Amino acid sequence: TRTLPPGVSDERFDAALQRFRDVVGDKWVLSTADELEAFRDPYPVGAAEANLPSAVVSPESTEQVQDIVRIANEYGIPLHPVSTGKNNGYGGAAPRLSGSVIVKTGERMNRILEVNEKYGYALLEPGVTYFDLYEYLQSHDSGLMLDCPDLGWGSVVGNTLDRGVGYTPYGDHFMWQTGLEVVLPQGEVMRTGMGALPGSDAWQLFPYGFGPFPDGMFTQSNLGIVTKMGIALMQRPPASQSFLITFDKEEDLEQIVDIMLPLRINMAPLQNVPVLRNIFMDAAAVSKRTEWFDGDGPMPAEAIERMKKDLDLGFWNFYGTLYGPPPLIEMYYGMIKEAFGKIPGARFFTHEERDDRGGHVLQDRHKINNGIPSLDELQQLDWVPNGGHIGFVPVSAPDGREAMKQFEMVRNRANEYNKDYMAQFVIGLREMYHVCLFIYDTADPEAREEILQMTKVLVREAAEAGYGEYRTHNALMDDVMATFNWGDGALLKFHEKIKDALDPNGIIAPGKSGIWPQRFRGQNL
Amino acid sequence: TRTLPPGVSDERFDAALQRFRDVVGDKWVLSTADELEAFRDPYPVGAAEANLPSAVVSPESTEQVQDIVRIANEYGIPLHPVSTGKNNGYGGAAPRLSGSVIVKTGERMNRILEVNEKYGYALLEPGVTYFDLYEYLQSHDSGLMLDCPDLGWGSVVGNTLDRGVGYTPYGDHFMWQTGLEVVLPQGEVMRTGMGALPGSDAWQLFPYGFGPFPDGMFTQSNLGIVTKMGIALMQRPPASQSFLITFDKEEDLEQIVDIMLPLRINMAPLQNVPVLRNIFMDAAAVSKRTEWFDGDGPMPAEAIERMKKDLDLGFWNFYGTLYGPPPLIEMYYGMIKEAFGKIPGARFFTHEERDDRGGHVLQDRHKINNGIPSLDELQQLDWVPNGGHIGFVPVSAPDGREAMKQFEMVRNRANEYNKDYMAQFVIGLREMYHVCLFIYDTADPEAREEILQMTKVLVREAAEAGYGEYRTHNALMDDVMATFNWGDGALLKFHEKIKDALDPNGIIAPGKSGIWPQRFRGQNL
Ligand SMILES: Cc1cc2nc3c(=O)[nH]c(=O)nc-3n(C[C@H](O)[C@H](O)[C@H](O)COP(=O)(O)OP(=O)(O)OC[C@H]3O[C@@H](n4cnc5c(N)ncnc54)[C@H](O)[C@@H]3O)c2cc1C
Ligand SMILES: Cc1cc2nc3c(=O)[nH]c(=O)nc-3n(C[C@H](O)[C@H](O)[C@H](O)COP(=O)(O)OP(=O)(O)OC[C@H]3O[C@@H](n4cnc5c(N)ncnc54)[C@H](O)[C@@H]3O)c2cc1C
Ligand SMILES: COc1cc(/C=C/CO)cc(OC)c1O
Ligand SMILES: COc1cc(/C=C/CO)cc(OC)c1O
Ligand SMILES: [Ca+2]
Ligand SMILES: [Ca+2]
Ligand SMILES: [Ca+2]
């Protein structure tokens, strides 16, 4: 065929593409199947085609984004805005609504607009990756550090707008977000916070501004195209130390979480964001499945014990990092060794104590936790051939028995659909993100379908136990919004009413987070 | 004359009140001149009458709130929701729009719904004062501590909904707000975050839920009536120590702020929210103006010197608190002494070192910063007869020169309108609230008119320098919103579209933060 926006003829789409070319330059409008292939989900879900873009437009300026949005309103073209488009696990760059035009802001709006060393912040355009920001801070001998997710090729801005997270004390990216500039769905531009007071220098010093705080309405959202975003940057501490605790039993998870909470809730001695990764997650970072089990179905217990023995890891591996003067590091590490020492079999290693293959993960977290971006986690996709992943991430109370129950519910479905269960518990002050990566052969349509069906059952199963996900893939967005339905869907009704108010023609990423504007509500897609 | 809602007849109002009576009980609907006098602004601003309530309704439950809002929609009666209604300095309980009915949620909805010791949170109704919650924590041998403003008789919820602040590490109340329940302007009820997932234990554990993050839109806002709100509660540390640094010269302000920033930006050694108060603010807390000066206008230099000598305080007095094991306190306090000691005339005191009258402020801060509510600061209102105050609170970069120019700018105008300039800088990580309390004789019409015209001038002057206010009085909300006018007022136009979409009848607190629903837009008020 040719992929087209819903309701839009071949003819009117050709016209609108030429309007875009007049705004951005012919170079920067892609509309052919060979050109669009790189903007498909690199980790596709389900057997069938889905989430197909009709074109890709790369603007160079806030002004060009306005003009793009005006043209889109004139023609009823839907727009999916991305920064770097690296949302792998949740859809890649692909739109939720098939036929949408991707607006890749970060291809050319990729400039670092300010890094302020005195007050510790940055003012960024969407194309700035973590690597770009790191090389800038290194170049200018900065005293600041950034906060990055596991992979460095994403966007500081784009990750924030999906409320992603990293692992330093500044790991809640949306919390340290300060000021943004946004083009609203009919082309008007707006600045939040002290940016709305012209001549203020405090756009990136004071988040709230005056009046209703709106910045949160542009995260996991479709109320506009963000063109600038500010973010706080932490001073680098004078030293740091990273550590691993290996735990032998699957059932250790309960005592691990329970001892952790008192050590974490006051942000000391667990100063950073700890991660609790199972042996499958760690083995996937350093080895192929076939090294351990070349056979059929779920991995047997003896192969698991071989994994743990060969890598000298446990079933549960705790990674953390301490910052500050060396005496403060010694004391805190002492408190952490005494507390988790009560769990029989716990073994402790610093980042200076492990140079084997099993310690490759520890060395990678020691980078990530010190604001040094990395791609070594890509090695996880070599667990199986042509590997891809989807993120199933329920929220869990920092309680041992609730975690244990989430672990068991998920592994039981994992086995049923013949998929390994790799887990990374990402631990905040009072909440945990229970990251379930399902790694699968993207060239196998049967595997792709099992992944769709399995995660659709897990969304439902988790919700029936009172567990929701914080973030999800294009293919699960409707399902996941449907679980947040207290008061006969009051939350969704709220978002719809606001969407239709700011977006009367229904242009911006329809269906993002399950939020469709009037003209699409009631169809399949 | 009877105070009536705009456009509502005497007969339609009387029917509407009776319907209110059928919902909450006849006891809980005040409407006579005598019953209303107590709900007028206790610190009135300007000579003229303004902000008059037409009635006060006191609901017992969320369901009654819903019914109140439905009746209001049917009769076009505007509703000013408040919790305890002690927003003194900003209007008290008085509505922005005269003729509004106050919905005082806190009078009967005053119950603590949950205090969770393990995860450290509260779930509260709007009527829970800081004293009430402190009493609960004391009776239950709680290991938690709250965070309170200077006056403990206000609402934890209400203060949060105006983005008020306290002085412990949890001093940013909105940040630690986690979950709320709200009756939207047409009577439907909604829960944010994990509260939207039926059966989740995580409403007060994970703030964001899924999809766009809305809770900020209900702060300093008129998009609904809030009926429940959660907030995180910090663990009480094993020890604390408060301290006072006195600085001799007016001109020291610049050096105090510039030495302060590097000790504050990493939240250590300045772990709490330091305040920097001037000698008038400290004298007003412990003495009357006439103890220093009886006569003509601004206070002369000899008299200021008498206050400093008699109270053993400086012109600028810096108050902080340290928390933790005594080794840590001592380390941090040694760092604070070594840095600020570089300013000639700096003098240092811990809370155990001063039992004189000048030390009463230090001892009050020592309570506040340890989560112990107080009404001692009410004494500042005895500076002059029939004392009242208004909060003019521009935001400042944490920069000595910026602080100095704000100080000079406000003092010049204070002099010009024959008022004393009481200052309390409230110091965040990257920003300062420059609290300018103007204390005045509320019974004197010319004094009230001076307050109105001086602060009108100050809003305009500050914004011409690139400064805005974080919070303001009823009388200044249109002037302050008007300064945030980047891109031809994009911010206010964004808020009005949301306002008109969730409040089609224009019911909830019209004019709050200068946001007026369409049916009032264009008129005087
Ligand atoms: C092995 C692996 C590990 C991972 N680890 C982590 C981790 O530790 N933490 C984590 O957070 N994620 C993690 N992820 C997920 C993903 O890699 C990152 O979150 C990634 O940074 C998101 O993609 P991005 O930065 O390119 O954002 P984008 O793809 O550019 O944006 C994501 C979404 O935000 C919205 N958006 C983006 N830009 C705009 C804009 N200008 N205007 C409006 N809306 C916009 C759109 O909805 C878009 O689809 C991991 C993924 C994998 C496969
Ligand atoms: C001497 C002095 C010192 C002060 N110090 C401080 C200080 O340190 N910190 C500080 O923050 N303030 C301070 N203030 C300001 C004020 O006294 C307090 O902030 C006070 O706690 C606010 O009043 P309240 O808690 O009763 O809230 P309320 O008056 O009950 O509510 C405040 C506002 O929030 C909104 N609101 C409240 N409840 C609801 C609801 N249920 N639904 C919808 N909207 C709602 C309304 O717009 C309402 O007017 C001070 C004032 C004085 C005079
Ligand atoms: C903490 O959030 C995430 C962490 C991770 C961590 C992956 C490491 O195996 C992945 C994600 O999406 C695919 C996330 O959203
Ligand atoms: C920090 O916020 C405020 C502090 C204060 C502190 C007053 C102490 O004199 C007052 C306010 O409004 C009147 C505030 O909004
Ligand atoms: Ca338990
Ligand atoms: Ca009923
Ligand atoms: Ca300076």
Residue numbers in the entry:
A (entry chain D), B (entry chain A): 2 to 526
Manuscript text:
On these grounds, we identified the same enzyme, EUGO from Rhodococcus jostii RHA1, as a promising candidate biocatalyst for the efficient and selective dehydrogenation of dihydrosinapyl alcohol into sinapyl alcohol. This VAO-type enzyme is easy to produce using Escherichia coli, and its crystal structure has been determined. To achieve this, a variant of eugenol oxidase was engineered for the oxidation of dihydrosinapyl alcohol into sinapyl alcohol with good conversion and chemoselectivity. To understand the effects of the introduced mutations in the EUGO8X and EUGO10X, their crystal structures were solved at 2.3 and 1.6 Å resolution, respectively.
The mutations identified from the initial screen, L381Q, S394A, S394V, I427A, and I427V were next individually incorporated into a thermostable variant of EUGO (EUGO S81H A423M H434Y I445D S518P, referred to hereafter as EUGO5X; Tm of 80 °C) that was obtained previously using the FRESCO algorithm. EUGO5X L381Q S394V I427V (“EUGO8X” hereafter) was more selective than EUGO5X L381Q S394V I427A, converting 90% of dihydrosinapyl alcohol with 77% chemoselectivity over 24 h. Despite this, however, the EUGO5X triple mutant was still not a perfect dihydrosinapyl alcohol dehydrogenase. By soaking the crystals with substrate, we obtained the structures in complex with dihydrosinapyl alcohol. Both catalysts contain five stabilizing mutations (S81H, A423M, H434Y, I445D, and S518P), as well as S394V, which have already been discussed in our previous engineering study of EUGO for the dehydrogenation of 4-propylguaiacol. Focusing on the hereby identified activity-improving mutations, the crystal structures show that I427V introduces more space for accommodating the second ortho-methoxy group of dihydrosinapyl alcohol relative to wild-type, explaining the improved conversions allowed by this mutation. L381Q meanwhile forms a new hydrogen bond with the hydroxy group of the substrate side chain, thereby forming a specific substrate–protein interaction. The combined effect of these mutations rationalizes the enhanced activity of the mutant toward dihydrosinapyl alcohol. By superposing the substrate-bound structures of EUGO8X and EUGO10X, a subtle ∼20° rotation of the plane of the aromatic ring and concomitant shift in the position of the propanol side chain of dihydrosinapyl alcohol can be observed.
